[PDB]
Design an enzyme around this catalytic site. Structure first.
Site, PDB file in Angstrom:
ATOM      1  N   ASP A 726       0.809  -1.218   0.000  1.00  0.00           N
ATOM      2  CA  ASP A 726       0.000   0.000   0.000  1.00  0.00           C
ATOM      3  C   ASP A 726       0.844   1.270   0.000  1.00  0.00           C
ATOM      4  OD1 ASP A 726      -1.271  -2.323   1.502  1.00  0.00           O
ATOM      5  OD2 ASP A 726      -3.059  -1.132   1.053  1.00  0.00           O
ATOM      6  N   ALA A 727       2.000   1.247  -0.656  1.00  0.00           N
ATOM      7  CA  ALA A 727       2.809   2.444  -0.828  1.00  0.00           C
ATOM      8  C   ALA A 727       2.698   2.942  -2.265  1.00  0.00           C
ATOM      9  CB  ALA A 727       4.272   2.169  -0.477  1.00  0.00           C
TER      10      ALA A 727
END
Ligand SMILES: [Zn+2]
Ligand SMILES: [Zn+2]
Ligand SMILES: [Zn+2]
Lengths: 1101, 65, 48
Positions: A726-727
């Site tokens: 989730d970056a």
DNA sequence: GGGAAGTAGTTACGCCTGGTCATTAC
DNA sequence: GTAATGAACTACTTCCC
RNA sequence: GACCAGGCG
């Protein structure tokens, strides 16, 4: 025919005419017009101990919003002036007092009893009916909807409590016994009473009354109210032969054992055990009068009606036992009523007035007793006027509105208004909260209900323990006010209904209830309900009346009270909707409005009761003969923030919830007057944009005029690790050109307070002599009057306003330095400086600091489909890949995050946004009516690209094309206000708590982190004892204590002669030193505070 | 607040051709033809003009001195 | 110590000393709110 | 005696933001 | 000017007719 | 310093 695109035109007029904050303004207007007069008329008057004096109350009036200066003058006030000067936006109250001397009324007099806060943009506010340019000239934003108070310069909003029905009867059943409990709540003058009647294994009916511990039997309490003869009880309750047999079984406990006064003796014995014999009768009669069903009255004459009501409740109880009625559901919305501002304010005003009248009585009695009758009767008007202290009302109302602690134990009634952006404020103004306790599970209460359709948003709710217990109103929801009940009752009595007293109910006759109470019977209710609803459609009666019937029990219900939640629908007759194309045309031109459509009978409101009899069709092409109503617009069942998500029916519910909750935190242009507006915190986005894919509701509600967020060119590609879990990865050149740039505000306040006597503060550049004088570097850019020059750079700990306090008594002749300084971890530029005067003459200054913030590592970015993350790496432009058509991605997202969350709406939005940008026209994505996916794919194919949305890209480093086509599009993205610049924190040494000498708490005051108990357990599990010793003792409080070895008490060390001795026992050689934590010494001292004596036994090593 | 000078993605200057586009689209022309005439080929630039709000004009009424 | 101040709603200059003045009011308007005007100094700002 | 019935004791860990207090009659 | 206060659970303990 | 309300994992 009528297509769904035509009903949208009709639906628009509802919001265009009514608004979005009606449930506050209407309730406050109703309270202003009638609540005050009713509250005043409740008391009647004052009865002092003067031999021949009495005062009767008259009328009450509300004046213009004004403020009184301390020197005497009174001048008009405006909301921005109140906000800046930290004042209270209130208006005075006036009351007429009629003196009565020897039983003869005199000429009336008028006195001011206090001040009342004013709801913004109400029927009495100064901003009512003004034009847009008038609001602009006054510093107000025309988009401001109003509906909140201004208390001491802060903005307060009253949420709505979801209470239970106020007089209904609800039956249930518990498994711990066979009890068939039926409980009611009775309301009279703000007093809530709980009354329950039930049976048990004995088969005898029992009654529970407040202040009566013992459950007195049913016949005993019935005979206390009269009608002692055994025929009367059975006639009062029912006539079913099985009920007759049950009642004959019940009577034998009291049929031939007691009379009317004997039951009074029993009740007196219970309520007053072992007291005076005469005391018992009066106590029992008082309890019977004003504790048993108070909503029927407290006069002794109403006892027959009370007995009838109790008999009806017992009849319901016994009908549950034989299975003639299913148990009631508490979560059904027909049993719940909302509490608005107009009733909470009523209760608060009631309690304040109750205090004020007693204070006035005491003052008048004391003044007459002291000065004598001649002074009182010399000038009666002056005597009445000068005996009123108009502060007990104002202060008590204002403190309750400010703190948020309502009388009666309730908490959280008033909350601070959330002003992050437009959506946050608009959603906060439409909250609904439950009074249950948060900690308990409450499995039944937190679940969704079928009756919530069209009244409560199903997706917007908090995420923590507050889930389910806090909800938001839908868009079609309409709250109702109250009409007078006597007129309704006398109208209902005029079309065939016989009174309950004249005729006894029997199973062949229908029952009729009005607001929960029984009023009579009729021979045919099926025609009666049709007649009443047809009269309502015609326009004879008000539209707040709803009628429903149940043929299983032969009952008819009529409701006319406030607090119900209703939704509008289209009337369908003979399988044909009553709305025609010409009606839509007339609405569009402007000849017809929503209220006229309501009046003509085309559209009617339905609450939870009427919807039982309805059979609603969903789409205009699905109607038939059986249907009775047509849904207006299914897309409007969602709340306000939850309607922002495009294509909301293609996503998982938790992702929609996350997106709806997260839409209230994004940065953007909140309000037009942010420059003048003084707030503790604020934000501003430099280049806001309108979403390319949007719902048509947002245009109508005015969101497009105050947007928040920008459109990014997003490529779904897996980069070199830096965008995993989730970056996200952002381009650098895009940032350098102004993407996602924002500014942060903050306001500081200083006051030149006045002390007891001639002592006072002063604005002044401190001299080097004064105590606490900081370094001369900090007083660098202060003008000689003590104020900082605007537009000057400031660092941490720099001084904004220089103030010197009076000396602190032990230091004599030494002023104390108490200047206001920037927070130790902030940085910015001074923006504006304001000088003004408070409400009591003291000076006041407010300073704002402006700081520019550029995206960096750790900043949180999030779309509206529930995808959130932080920036992982910033990449130079030449290293990013580029499509063969000339497009460079603005953002990179990991493909591993798509399948698990199942947010297909994001891909749909990407395709739609790219198509919209190519075509030069925005794309509609309004819920179930938006453009279908296949049309968008075909249009994209026509425009020249590929229907799958993929393209060919070249690697930015090696310089050759990748092996796979890459999905790429345009997606709306938002920047949250959880920046990393406000979370970094580090401590080495600093201030400590006074009591325990441990590091302080909080980032704001250089506190330290907490080493909780599971961290200690983890350290134990690893086995590092010395690490535990270092972390828990060395880096925390530590001290040396002298211990007497002979007796075990703690020794005493004297500095005057450097001698150490034990006080309790004369020992001076065995004294030893022990190293221990200070908190344990405090624990030993606290144990010795009680009579417990801990004795210490030392040991070597 | 006001129209950005350069397109974020590719840096092309588009800040001087917003008013002409707005006027010609308010005059009843086809937006696609107008955008093609103005010379904006890549959609990364069309996104800038197609989705802008002029919020400068309604905030000058509040002056701070 | 005499300093220049500007009215909150009129914008016209007001000249008074804060040390001894007992009430703050524009002689031209009933308002009691005043600004502190910016100094005349060439502030320098980076273009990044 | 062994059935009520009435006490008595609990209900995850951090962190952040802001707002209010801390008597009064003479 | 000041002296003056105004919802669930579970296991024990106590009955008790 | 203690309370109240709202958020984050
Ligand atoms: Zn000793
Ligand atoms: Zn471009
Ligand atoms: Zn002025």
């Amino acid at each position: 025919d009528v297509t769904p695109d035509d009903l949208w035109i009709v639906m628009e007029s509802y919001w265009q005419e009514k608004g979005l904050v009606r449930q506050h303004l209407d309730s406050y207007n109703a309270f202003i017009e009638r609540g005050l007069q009713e509250v005043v008329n409740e008391f009647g008057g004052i009865k002092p101990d003067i031999p021949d004096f009495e005062v009767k109350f008259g009328k009450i009036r509300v004046g213009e919003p004004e403020f009184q200066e301390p020197h005497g003058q009174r001048k008009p006030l405006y909301p921005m002036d109140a906000r800046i000067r930290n004042l209270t936006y209130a208006a005075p109250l006036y009351l007429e007092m009629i003196p009565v001397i020897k039983g003869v009324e005199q000429d009336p007099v008028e006195v001011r009893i206090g001040e009342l806060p004013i709801m913004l943009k109400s029927k009495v506010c100064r901003l009512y009916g003004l034009s847009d340019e008038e609001l602009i000239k006054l510093g107000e934003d025309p988009k401001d909807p109003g509906g909140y108070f201004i208390i001491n310069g802060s903005e307060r909003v009253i949420v709505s409590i979801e209470d239970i029905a106020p007089n209904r009867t609800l039956v249930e059943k518990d498994e711990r016994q066979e009890k068939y409990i039926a409980k009611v709540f009775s309301y009279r003058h703000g007093y809530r009473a709980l009354v329950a009647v039930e049976r048990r294994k004995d088969g005898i009916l029992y009654v529970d009354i407040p202040n009566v511990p013992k459950p007195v039997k049913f016949v005993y309490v019935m005979r206390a109210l009269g009608l002692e003869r055994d025929k009367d009880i059975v006639e009062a309750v029912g006539n079913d032969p099985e009920v007759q047999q049950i009642m004959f079984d019940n009577l034998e406990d009291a049929s031939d054992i007691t009379t009317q006064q004997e039951a009074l003796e029993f009740i007196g014995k219970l309520v007053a055990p072992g007291q005076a014999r005469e005391y018992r009768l009066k106590r029992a009669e008082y309890v019977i009068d004003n504790n048993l069903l108070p909503h029927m009255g407290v006069s002794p004459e109403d006892r027959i009606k009370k007995a009838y009501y109790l008999g009806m409740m017992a009849l319901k109880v016994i009908e549950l036992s034989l299975g003639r009625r299913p148990e009631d559901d508490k979560d059904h919305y027909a049993n719940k009523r909302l509490r608005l501002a107009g009733d909470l304010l009523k209760d608060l005003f009631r309690v304040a007035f109750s205090q004020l009248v007693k204070d006035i009585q005491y003052q008048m009695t004391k003044t007459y007793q002291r000065k004598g009758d001649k002074y009182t009767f010399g000038n009666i008007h002056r005597f009445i006027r000068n005996s009123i202290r108009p502060d007990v009302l104002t202060e008590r109302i204002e403190h309750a509105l400010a703190t948020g602690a309502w009388p009666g134990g309730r908490t959280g009634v008033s909350q601070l208004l959330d002003r992050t952006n437009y959506m946050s404020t608009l959603s906060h103004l439409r909250r609904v909260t439950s009074p249950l306790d948060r900690e308990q599970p409450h499995f039944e209460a937190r679940d969704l209900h079928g009756t919530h359709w069209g009244r409560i948003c199903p997706t917007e709710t908090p995420e923590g323990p507050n889930c389910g217990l806090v909800k938001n109103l839908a868009l079609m929801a309409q709250i109702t006010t109250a009409v007078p009940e006597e007129e309704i009752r006398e109208y209902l009595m005029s079309l065939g209904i016989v009174p309950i007293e004249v005729r006894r109910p029997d199973p062949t006759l229908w029952r009729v209830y009005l607001n929960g109470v029984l009023i009579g019977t009729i021979e045919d209710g099926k025609a009666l309900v049709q007649r009443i609803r047809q009269d309502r459609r015609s326009g004879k009666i008000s539209d707040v009346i709803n009628v429903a019937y149940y043929e299983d029990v032969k009952e008819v219900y009529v409701n006319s009270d406030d607090g119900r939640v209703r939704r509008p629908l289209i009337i369908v007759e003979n399988g044909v909707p009553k709305l025609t194309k010409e009606h839509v045309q007339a609405v569009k031109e402007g000849r017809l409005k929503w209220s006229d459509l309501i009046k003509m009978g085309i559209i009617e409101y339905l609450d939870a009761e009427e919807e039982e009899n309805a059979y609603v069709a969903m789409w205009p092409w699905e109607v038939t003969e059986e249907h009775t109503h047509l849904e207006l617009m299914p897309a409007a069942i969602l709340g306000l923030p939850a309607s922002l998500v495009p294509y909301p029916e293609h996503n998982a519910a938790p992702r929609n919830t996350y997106g709806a909750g997260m839409a209230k935190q994004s940065l953007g242009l909140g309000w037009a007057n942010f420059r003048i507006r003084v707030d503790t915190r604020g934000h501003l986005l430099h280049y806001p944009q309108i979403p390319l894919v949007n719902s048509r509701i947002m245009k109508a509600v005015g969101y497009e005029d105050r947007p928040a967020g920008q459109n990014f060119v997003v490529a779904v590609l897996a980069y070199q690790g830096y965008n995993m879990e989730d970056a996200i990865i952002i381009n650098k050149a895009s940032i350098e050109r102004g993407l996602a740039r924002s500014t942060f505000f903050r306001t500081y306040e200083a006051e030149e307070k006045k002390y007891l006597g001639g002592q006072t503060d002063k604005f002044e550049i401190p001299d080097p002599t004064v105590r606490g004088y900081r370094g001369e570097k900090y007083y660098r850019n202060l003008d000689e009057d003590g104020l900082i020059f605007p537009e000057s750079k400031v660092e941490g700990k720099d001084v904004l306003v220089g103030r010197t306090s009076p000396p602190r008594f032990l230091s004599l002749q030494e002023r104390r330095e108490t200047s206001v300084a920037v927070r130790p971890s902030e940085k910015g530029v001074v923006d504006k400086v304001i000088i003004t005067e408070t409400g009591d003459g003291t000076k006041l200054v407010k300073v704002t600091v402006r700081d520019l913030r550029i995206p960096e590592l750790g900043d949180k970015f999030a779309s509206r489909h529930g995808q959130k993350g932080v920036i992982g790496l910033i990449v130079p432009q030449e290293d990013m890949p580029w499509t063969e058509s000339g497009i460079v991605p603005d953002l990179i997202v990991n493909p591993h995050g798509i399948p698990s969350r199942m947010t297909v709406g994001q891909l749909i939005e990407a395709i739609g946004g790219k198509v919209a940008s190519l075509k030069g026209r925005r794309v509609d994505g309004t819920a179930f009516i938006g453009e279908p996916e296949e049309k968008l794919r075909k249009e994209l194919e026509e425009l020249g690209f590929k229907h799958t949305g993929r393209e060919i890209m070249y690697d930015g480093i090696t310089g050759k094309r990748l092996e796979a086509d890459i999905f790429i599009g345009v997606i709306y993205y938002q920047r949250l206000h959880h920046m990393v610049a406000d979370k970094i924190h580090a401590r080495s040494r600093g201030p400590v708590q006074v009591l325990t000498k441990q590091p302080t708490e909080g980032r704001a005051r250089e506190g330290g982190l907490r080493f909780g108990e599971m961290e200690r357990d983890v350290l134990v599990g690893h086995g590092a004892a010395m690490l535990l010793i270092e972390r828990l003792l060395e880096e925390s409080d530590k001290t040396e204590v002298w211990v007497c070895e002979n007796c075990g008490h703690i020794a005493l060390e004297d500095k005057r002669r450097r001698r150490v001795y034990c006080p309790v026992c004369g020992e001076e050689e065995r004294i030893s030193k022990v190293e221990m934590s200070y908190a344990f010494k405090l624990l030993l001292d606290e144990l010795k505070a009680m009579v417990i004596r801990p004795k210490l036994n030392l040991s070597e090593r | 607040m006001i129209v950005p000078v350069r397109c974020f993605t590719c840096g092309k200057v588009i800040g001087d051709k917003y008013y002409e586009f707005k006027r010609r689209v308010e005059a009843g022309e086809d937006p696609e033809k107008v955008l093609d005439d103005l010379g904006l080929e890549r959609y990364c630039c069309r996104r800038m003009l197609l989705s802008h709000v002029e919020l400068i004009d309604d905030i000058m009424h509040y002056r701070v001195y | 110590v005499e300093a220049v101040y500007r009215c909150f709603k009129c914008g016209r200059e007001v000249k008074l000393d804060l040390s001894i003045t007992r009430d703050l009011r524009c002689p031209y308007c009933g308002s009691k709110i005043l600004y502190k005007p910016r100094p005349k100094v060439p502030r320098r700002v980076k273009a990044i």
